[model samples]
Target: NLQLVSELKNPSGSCSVDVSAMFWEKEPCIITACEDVVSLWKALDAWQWEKLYTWHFAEVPVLQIVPVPDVYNLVCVALGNLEIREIRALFCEKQVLLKSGNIKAVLGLTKRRLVSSSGTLSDQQVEVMTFAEDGGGKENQFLMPPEETILTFAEVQGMQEALLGTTIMNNIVIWNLKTGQLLKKMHIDDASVCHKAYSEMGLLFIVLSPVFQLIVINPKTTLSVGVMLYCLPPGQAGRFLEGDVKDHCAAAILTSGTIAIWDLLLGQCTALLPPVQHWSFVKWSGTDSHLLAGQKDGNIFVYHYS
Candidate 1:
């Protein structure tokens, strides 16, 4: 099941891509930000990108490019002194600009409100900002932070809860969104290594960290019950996790330089992916049926993981 069916070579020198923004639909595709422009290309299996359309928002420095694939919602957040909190959403023919506070992650969006997690340069706390109708007031403001700075954070689909990993804390904080209640905090050994999390089926909060360790938490219990071991080397900052439908199925890149899929219900490594020494980026397709990965050398590989 872990065979490389195809490879595509990108000859561009600045081909840095975010796998999370690469989406798979009827025809798989990915969005990339390069040369101050956001480009969307149809992903042809085997590492080739046929440029579909390029959207250039060249006014200010682009901070992050987030792609909402299903709706073709392309979000461009700006940096620099101009439009520091500026964000724009590009739909097919329509574009909407927003002045949300320095956004870190766009958690969830609705017709009524935009939920996102952002950090402040002035404070150690990270903010969960919800923008709603009538200019999207910030009636609900919540903060989760470490004494130093926030390293990484992940959110559920509904935007009601989130997991924050902090520097110097060497721990992860789970917080309730609307109520601003502190739900639970779990400690881990390595504070320096990066962490990524996935919350599924309202049952488990799955975290991947330190290249070889996984923390599985039951929200009901509010404590981690399953800590698994892996073969990935320690200290790699590229570890990742992806899952759908609770812990029924999930995919992750181990520090060992390979991709593995797990069946938490079955409690086994269902598949061990092809060997790759370095994965600059990795993402699960929209439906979670396929995996899109990029090598450090500008090569891309797509795997059928279901």
Candidate 2:
């Protein structure tokens, strides 16, 4: 049974009625809004709902939400009044905790992170906020002294470690996560690279705007890798919803449609299931081989991945 546990109310309403990005750590849906701050809920079982941490500048207008693996930490990319702002997740309190935006965008050898083009900010330096490993010294939060602000900020996991390729103002950017550096950057030129995903085996999958052809960017030590277009059904591509089907690739067609599963590695589709209403991403849960999808209409769909 679905039960409403709590609701977050903003003074002048939220930046948008629906949430922009949300992810699942285990069961509850972690939702992000443009108004700044991430909310939590036990979306699966009902009743385990709670709001934790308001982590961002007041009315900073968040434009992007990317959840790193393991939930050790989460990366939040925000859009400021005229530029990109950011919020770092801090674990506090016996209650649900609270979120705070302690960092802003800095430009230099690093990238300015990512912000929506339609958004008010346009600084494209790739401001990737990640966690750096403990040198056994000590790591704490503090504002940069304006000098190191560009060179080094707080505990953001830097991209210099795992970054493979480089794409300036292009569509796809891959990072190693461990190294905190970019691996490569794929492109669609003026058109944005709408959606991109990585497979369990380090395969880089990308989808470009307008055309929406699925491409594989197999990365090697030497840039010998190239793009290979896959055969998806003829239709416009929205976000590739396949997280639920983690082992395979999948997608949805409007609100009511069956999800089509493809052998992403083989570029061959394996199965097609009935249409699901809402979700932004679909992937697999590895544990029980369950397929999960992030509904675009604010819902998550789970299926057995066979």
Candidate 3:
């Protein structure tokens, strides 16, 4: 069962909705980005949230925001101008200009390292860069084959070497971050709307649309299994699908405003939460049994599940 614990509303009802939002792994804080402004909010009580800090970027629009792993109140924001800004507290600490143009997304690998994807659908490039305390380091670049667009990607957990699950052209391509080498490519047959990798099980949970199926893939053996969502009625399809995986479970948000939770080990739909209109993002908290869903209206809903 799930209960809506809190609803954090936008202070300013502007047209600039949240481009991205993420929960702090170290504390009960939420980071939200709306166009050029990024704000931090803290949970003061069970049903209350307090605005703690705000960073306003003049002129530049934020494309994506990712929190630095193991760091508190620090985040990396990818800009429309092909630059990544490192922000700490109330100051913009450093800015790294990326040679790859138009960043599609960014992921924080560590406190001092981050990775970003750029380029058009025809020619995609991913850059893994590390930043020194004073702001300088080596940048490693990886190029995807022409016409193979990167639909979505995430870091593989519990691995000796860092690996990435990059979905492109109906295939889940595993790449080693350190060497920038392609380790394996597993075809899924359908377009993966989004995917999450769990290294402990050596599996990737991918959601495919139109058919509303959940596919589980073992990266080691390149074998995959599917669990169909038989609960949905016929003739309906999701316009967009985004999801997250934790342990043996996964959750996906459909454009139809439906939120589906699946038990990976059981291979069945465990719960379907009430629909919320215009849902943009869904993520599970790393430290607790909380699921946070963000909306295009800049509001966030926190659900506690057991």
Candidate 4:
């Protein structure tokens, strides 16, 4: 059974494009970015929210927020001003210049390592940065092909490689993170807007849009198997897809008001969520069968699956 559990609203009324939930200080917390401020909320009993802290930047808006693995209370905040700040416990400790125009997304590889994609469609770049405690660093920057913007990227855990999708091509590019080399380029049917890597299964799940197809590919062989979603309403476009490999399910959130969940393994539609009128984001949260849907009105709905 899947049921709604709770809802939390932001008083600011301006929810940004990123939201994340993680365990901080051994407690469950939801993090959201609104303009130049990043707010951390404590998930209390009875599914209520208590604003624990807020970190504010001077004038630039935060474009992305990513939690650092193997660390508590540490997050990588990508700002609109071509910068990334390492903030821990709501305090900005270290900052790095992205130097790549506009930051589209940021991913934390570890407490000290991060990957970021930035720049315009014509001149995009993906960079991996490493930090040191004594204020020194190393950065490996990879320039994308002309007119190709990186839509999304996912790290292949334990493999020192990453898979990325670009805007202008129906192809997936694999990069060797350690050597800064282009490993391989695999072709698909359409451009991908989302990527989920299930390294344990030797599979990468990609959501191709403008046609809205979900496909599974084996990284080693570059072979793919796809399942077209006919459940979606005709004439409508998909916004994105989010996957939870741990739960063996994925959510296809359309550009309109519909959202559907599918069994990741069986490739069958499992459930259709109630229509969400506004544009929203859905994500899996914490170490439970919990899903969070955030709307444009700054309201976040929590769902539990059993």
The lDDT per prediction is 0.50, 0.36, 0.61, 0.61
All models, RMSD in angstroms: 6.3, 9.4, 4.6, 4.7
Residue-by-residue lDDT tens digits, candidate 4, 205-300: 655442245677887888887754434444444554443333456665665556666665665666667654553666777546877777766778
- Considering lDDT, which of the candidate structures 1 and 3 is the better prediction for this target? 3
Q: Point out where model 1 deviates above 4 Å.
A: 3-9, 20-28, 33-37, 43-49, 56-71, 76-122, 129-148, 156-167, 186-204, 216-226, 232-261, 264-267, 270-278
Per residue, candidate 3 scores C-alpha lDDT tens digits across 122-226 of: 566766766655445545656343335556666666665464544556777767766777777778754555444556466666545432455768777788887
lDDT of 1 by residue, 1-306 (tens): 555554555544444444333443344565554325555667554545576765555445554454332333344344333324566654433446754565544433323234444553445445444443223334556554444445555554333545444344666666675566666676653433333455656654444542334566665655665466543333333454432222345566656566666664555667766565466556555534666676655566767665
Give the Cα error of residue 204 in candidate 4, in Å.
Answer: 5.3
Better model by TM-score: candidate 1 vs candidate 4:
4
Q: How are the candidates ranked when ordered by TM-score, highest leading?
A: 4, 3, 1, 2
> TM-scores for all candidates?
0.61, 0.46, 0.74, 0.74
Worst 10 residues of 3 by lDDT: 85-94
What's the lDDT of the predicted structure labeled candidate 4?
0.61
TM-score of 2: 0.46
